Amino acid sequence: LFTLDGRVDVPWARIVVHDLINSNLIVHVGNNVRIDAFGLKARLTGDLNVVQDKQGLGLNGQINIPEGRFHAYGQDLIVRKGELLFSGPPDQPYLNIEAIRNPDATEDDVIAGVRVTGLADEPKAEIFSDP
Amino acid sequence: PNLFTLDGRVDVPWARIVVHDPINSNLIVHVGNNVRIDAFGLKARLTGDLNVVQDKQGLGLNGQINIPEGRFHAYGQDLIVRKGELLFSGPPDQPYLNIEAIRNPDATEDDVIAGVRVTGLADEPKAEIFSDPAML
């Protein structure tokens, strides 16, 4: 069987989603990595230890969202803080995300702000009013 | 049915590759200064650049991998890689080879082999065995 261990740097990438064998890798997400997916347009940074063995894929580390905009479902929000903390299960990071109304938004009834926290399948969301 | 696209650049400053016994992407992979392979008697350091492109038709691989240093265990003997290049021109599992490896046969009158050179597509290569270390 083949194994691959190492360190990988991703200085730039573009990930878009359009509607219309064995490893241990440390992956460093560099300074021009952007995603456009599911209403989120964002820049991502961070570091992940990607372990793959017979049981499956493990992810440990942190992915951060230094800048982003979520525009979907009548809502236009600017990400003020965004962190995903992975502790093994790839589909279950801990979320800590804050976003506020885009003051340039054209839609009305856009929430003043939201915070989403907790494991991605047990999340909690706080929705704030304008003072 | 939704389309996933991935473009970008990947740098691999460190790696160890051991061999025991709808998505569109275009990636530039730069193989850096501490990438080594251990497989089938070959212990070698690798460098170079590969463009990996993937779409509905399949995977394509283009670029060049160099072997700046390596050794190869064949029969009871050891050969030191003097020059090594693999050229990828589309088919990922069929690079063009050009590899030269040498050993010293001069201790004994009988020992003849001074070098080996392997050239051609990886599935139908030619091997030249030389008694002069020169290969010219």
Author numbering:
A (entry chain B): 977 to 996, 1026 to 1136
B (entry chain A): 975 to 995, 1025 to 1139
From the paper:
In this work, we report the crystal structure of TamB963-1138 from E. coli, a region spanning half of the conserved DUF490 domain. One of these constructs, consisting of residues 963–1,138 of TamB (designated TamB963-1138) produced diffraction quality crystals and data was collected and anisotropically processed to 1.86–2.2 Å (Josts et al., 2014, Strong et al., 2006). As no homologs of TamB have been structurally characterized, selenomethionine-labeled protein was prepared, crystalized, and the structure was solved using single-wavelength anomalous dispersion (SAD). The crystal structure of TamB963-1138 revealed an elongated taco-shaped molecule consisting entirely of β sheet and random coil. This β taco structure is formed by two molecules of TamB963-1138, which interact via their N-terminal β strand to form a continuous 16-stranded curved β structure. Between the first and second β strands 29 residues lack electron density due to disorder. Proline residues 987 and 1,071 at the center of β strands 1 and 4 and glycine 1,035 at the center of β strand 2 create a discontinuity which kinks of the β sheet, facilitating the curvature of the β taco. The most striking feature of the TamB963-1138 crystal structure is that the interior surface of its β taco is populated entirely by aliphatic and aromatic residues, making this interior cavity highly hydrophobic. During purification of TamB963-1138 it was found that the detergent lauryldimethylamine N-oxide (LDAO) was required for stabilization of the domain. Electron density possibly attributable to the aliphatic chains of stabilizing LDAO molecules is evident inside the TamB963-1138 cavity.
